[PDB]
């Protein structure tokens, strides 16, 4: 009864898409809400444990750049309910409308994503699916990291997952599936590196390639890395160095989010101001 | 003719948003020679601030177009000549206000409140002349701006409490002078942060009207400090 | 004292500087040139004079309202009035410039029907603007010429132009408010407004969306 | 517990103002944060009760229109930490900078605020100090209700937002959901008015005395001309002298939302404008 929402209180609206372990609709509950739901009569023990883990993780997230979890329901079907974000995912803005973002707003989007993952890692949370689609822009101004279905707390008995099609953000160790914990803070850092690649190039990585299945093998191998030569010229040099640092093939040389955040915060201060000062107005 | 008829037609020009008319009315009122009232002071200030602000905004737009026009040599010539037309208007407005200050307002300011208010207005209009002056007279104008600002600042700190809206506004505009004109962000943030921090201490002190007057400028100081440190 | 291209460039530059008096002067010279304006030059002339005269209309309404609410004070009322007639004079001069340009160049040099309905609409709008401040002995005449030009354009409007067409949609809006405001014939005006909106819903993409909202607001408030 | 922030993680920056039981600073903790901190050396037993009561109320709030509580600290001195909101308070924009908001933006602010206290009352939370000073704007996009230092879960000097029964205080606990609805009515008065109510009375004790008897009520004729008539009626409903004639927040929220829809561009006749 902590964050549980009684049945009947949530008016579920139009189907908007799918999330990790359910389909997402728009809903009305003291305003707008998003609802990720599982369209099944009876959850299996595996879907119910997955849902329980996601609620447990979201109940520890309380940050401006994390999609605000608002409650959960069990009664009709299992459902996670969040704040509603008018707008689109950053994936939609970058590759589906080519919304012309200024380099300044691109820097700010990266900085807010870094703040969100700084918070997550400081609470020992690994997202394990950070991608441009799980980044939502509220009112095309604020970043909200969402979709915690594959997230976990860093624990000894961690996890056990349906990796599926979205694999571009997967780090080489996660592709190879050969070490102790393929998912880690460094796997999240590499996913972050790929999202900065998308922010600074405008396109997805490994875009101009001939074959598609081997691509994995090449990344797994170390044979293929993002083409950093497609970063646009107005992208600051510190930002390109930082993305290279987040994309380095061996986990242990990749930086941690406290210093990723500090680097994005400091380089963002060296870009020319877009506004002017304000002076005393007319009384 | 009457001073009060001029003040009333100034208010009516303010209501119709004909700021050139309000400015003319207030200029007539100040040329009569008597010390202005607080309302008359604020009407003159509002009038000329709108009159000159229209030109500052237009100047910025066409100046930006002027530098950002590369291929076309004839188009860039046209933007340059229109920028100079706007600039001439700008300068005339500022010279009008600075003449009013020097000849009537500054000499007739008995109280300290008035003399910091008018010296700060002198700093503001020389600062508007600094925003467009190029090369030769630039240094002279920048110096005159800083000098008026500096004298008003000293008198502010010696007879006005840190929360006084005129002193707070002087702090805001002088810090903007430092940032935008002298290009010295650090000194600008120093002046701004000091004034804001000194006001925040005593903010609990003030009445609810005084608090509205003071907070309106303190929010601008903190907005500036947020923008300058970001 | 310069080329039509030089004046159009200074007009576009004055537009981005929001100096509508300069833009109006530029477009006035360009039209006194004698040649038919392009859609862009037409559009710049429209924007220029509409802003120039709109500032005066806004000031006129503010100062008239202040005139109204002056009670028990001649000199207050006397100042507001004399100021209202100053604005009024400016108001007339602007419209006289625009109507002289319309009659000596714009309508006569209009090749296609689109241009001549647009310019006759503008003709009706500026006589209309004159209408709002007309005194009464000459009021009648100006109103008569307003509707005459308006309807002349109206006759050609829904005859060669598609129901979605904005010049047409706007002409209706201005003609309907002409009947409703200038004169007092809400029924005709309301007849016209609902007729045009429903014919538009029957059959620019973003341009028409907002003119149909202005039509729906109009009728909602007029009834 | 799981919301406590270890000392040293929060860098406290500039002192920016005051709150219910402390002074407010800007801080850095995985980004920007607001920090309300009581600077007392040794908290007295009443201050720890106020602070833990406020933390208890805030940890039950999880809504876009409530200032998002992020954690608390006790180590150096007791501290409540929330998300940072860069725009000021609604009171600031309305009465100190007189930011000219369009009526559409005013309606949206009232609508968001209504959502925030519908959420609050639906979790049996009474704020008891709702005023434009406690309404924060986040980048001119979101409204955020804050400062729950005087809030409570209802279990078995800001005078102009106090309902008459709250002024009288003849009852043991005059505060209720309805009292909050009356404060909301006053905030709507500010939004549709541009001014604070009772602008002509000078002294605070006089105004307390007259509103408590009922001799004094807000002057609604001072509502701006483009204010929808439904909004004016709703203000009247939320401000009725007697508590039980006031609507509930589901009903207030539903009518403002419905009301937000269908708002005309401008009030009078309109001609074609392309410029
Ligand atoms: O690919 C885009 C489709 N799409 C998916 C979501 C979504 C995804 C995951 C989750 C929720 C919503 C809510 C709960 C959840 N995770 O637990 C959204 C969305 C999020 C926020 N506001 C509006 C829409 N759009
Ligand atoms: O009203 C102007 C002065 N001012 C006071 C606050 C404030 C007030 C109360 C509380 C907090 C902050 C945080 C904790 C709290 N209540 O518990 C803020 C503010 C709020 C949010 N973001 C930035 C600033 N500004």
Short mmCIF file of N, CA and C and ligand atoms in Angstrom, two decimals, chain B residues 211 222, chain D residues 16-20 24 34-36 54 58 67 80-89 133-134 136 146-149, ligand 2:
data_model
loop_
_atom_site.label_atom_id
_atom_site.label_comp_id
_atom_site.label_asym_id
_atom_site.label_seq_id
_atom_site.Cartn_x
_atom_site.Cartn_y
_atom_site.Cartn_z
N UNK B 211 9.94 44.67 0.12
CA UNK B 211 10.38 43.36 -0.33
C UNK B 211 10.09 43.14 -1.81
N UNK B 222 20.63 37.45 -9.40
CA UNK B 222 20.92 36.02 -9.32
C UNK B 222 20.75 35.36 -10.68
N UNK D 16 19.96 31.85 -0.92
CA UNK D 16 19.01 32.46 -1.83
C UNK D 16 17.71 32.87 -1.16
N UNK D 17 17.39 32.38 0.04
CA UNK D 17 16.16 32.84 0.66
C UNK D 17 15.85 32.10 1.94
N UNK D 18 14.56 32.08 2.28
CA UNK D 18 14.08 31.44 3.49
C UNK D 18 12.91 30.51 3.16
N UNK D 19 12.64 29.61 4.10
CA UNK D 19 11.55 28.67 4.00
C UNK D 19 10.75 28.62 5.28
N UNK D 20 10.11 27.48 5.55
CA UNK D 20 9.25 27.36 6.72
C UNK D 20 10.05 27.41 8.02
N UNK D 24 17.23 28.85 2.83
CA UNK D 24 17.32 28.09 1.59
C UNK D 24 18.56 28.55 0.82
N UNK D 34 17.78 22.39 -4.41
CA UNK D 34 17.47 23.41 -3.42
C UNK D 34 17.63 22.77 -2.05
N UNK D 35 18.16 23.54 -1.10
CA UNK D 35 18.45 23.00 0.23
C UNK D 35 17.86 23.95 1.26
N UNK D 36 16.88 23.47 2.03
CA UNK D 36 16.37 24.20 3.18
C UNK D 36 17.06 23.64 4.41
N UNK D 54 8.03 17.26 8.42
CA UNK D 54 8.08 17.70 7.03
C UNK D 54 8.66 16.61 6.13
N UNK D 58 6.73 14.85 2.97
CA UNK D 58 7.30 14.93 1.63
C UNK D 58 7.61 13.56 1.02
N UNK D 67 6.92 20.03 -5.64
CA UNK D 67 8.38 20.17 -5.57
C UNK D 67 9.00 18.86 -5.13
N UNK D 80 16.55 19.63 4.33
CA UNK D 80 15.65 19.06 3.35
C UNK D 80 16.15 19.47 1.98
N UNK D 81 16.20 18.52 1.06
CA UNK D 81 16.76 18.75 -0.27
C UNK D 81 15.70 18.41 -1.31
N UNK D 82 15.49 19.33 -2.25
CA UNK D 82 14.52 19.14 -3.32
C UNK D 82 15.20 19.40 -4.65
N UNK D 83 14.45 19.16 -5.72
CA UNK D 83 14.88 19.53 -7.05
C UNK D 83 15.02 21.05 -7.14
N UNK D 84 15.88 21.50 -8.04
CA UNK D 84 16.07 22.93 -8.22
C UNK D 84 15.10 23.46 -9.26
N UNK D 85 14.49 24.59 -8.99
CA UNK D 85 13.61 25.27 -9.91
C UNK D 85 14.08 26.65 -10.22
N UNK D 86 14.57 26.82 -11.43
CA UNK D 86 15.17 28.08 -11.83
C UNK D 86 14.33 29.31 -11.98
N UNK D 87 13.04 29.18 -12.22
CA UNK D 87 12.20 30.36 -12.24
C UNK D 87 11.84 30.71 -10.83
N UNK D 88 11.29 31.85 -10.53
CA UNK D 88 11.02 32.14 -9.11
C UNK D 88 9.71 31.68 -8.62
N UNK D 89 9.19 32.31 -7.61
CA UNK D 89 7.90 31.90 -7.13
C UNK D 89 6.84 32.59 -7.90
N UNK D 133 3.66 32.34 -2.98
CA UNK D 133 5.07 32.25 -2.63
C UNK D 133 5.56 30.81 -2.62
N UNK D 134 4.67 29.85 -2.35
CA UNK D 134 5.00 28.43 -2.29
C UNK D 134 4.71 27.71 -3.60
N UNK D 136 6.31 27.36 -7.37
CA UNK D 136 7.56 27.62 -8.06
C UNK D 136 7.45 27.27 -9.53
N UNK D 146 5.48 23.75 -3.14
CA UNK D 146 6.53 23.45 -2.19
C UNK D 146 6.37 23.95 -0.77
N UNK D 147 7.42 23.76 0.04
CA UNK D 147 7.46 24.14 1.46
C UNK D 147 6.35 23.48 2.27
N UNK D 148 6.48 22.18 2.54
CA UNK D 148 5.48 21.45 3.32
C UNK D 148 5.80 21.45 4.81
N UNK D 149 6.50 22.48 5.29
CA UNK D 149 6.86 22.53 6.69
C UNK D 149 5.67 22.65 7.61
O1 LIG E 2 10.54 32.19 -2.86
C1 LIG E 2 11.85 32.66 -3.21
C2 LIG E 2 12.86 32.08 -2.22
N1 LIG E 2 12.86 30.63 -2.41
C3 LIG E 2 12.53 29.72 -1.47
C4 LIG E 2 12.64 28.48 -2.02
C5 LIG E 2 12.36 27.26 -1.23
C6 LIG E 2 11.38 27.31 -0.23
C7 LIG E 2 11.10 26.20 0.53
C8 LIG E 2 11.81 25.01 0.32
C9 LIG E 2 12.80 24.96 -0.66
C10 LIG E 2 13.08 26.07 -1.43
C11 LIG E 2 13.43 23.58 -0.69
C12 LIG E 2 12.88 22.86 0.55
C13 LIG E 2 11.71 23.69 1.00
N2 LIG E 2 10.71 23.28 1.71
O2 LIG E 2 10.79 22.05 2.41
C14 LIG E 2 13.06 28.65 -3.37
C15 LIG E 2 13.33 27.64 -4.42
C16 LIG E 2 12.53 26.50 -4.59
C17 LIG E 2 12.84 25.60 -5.60
N3 LIG E 2 13.88 25.82 -6.39
C18 LIG E 2 14.65 26.88 -6.27
C19 LIG E 2 14.42 27.82 -5.29
N4 LIG E 2 13.19 29.95 -3.58
#
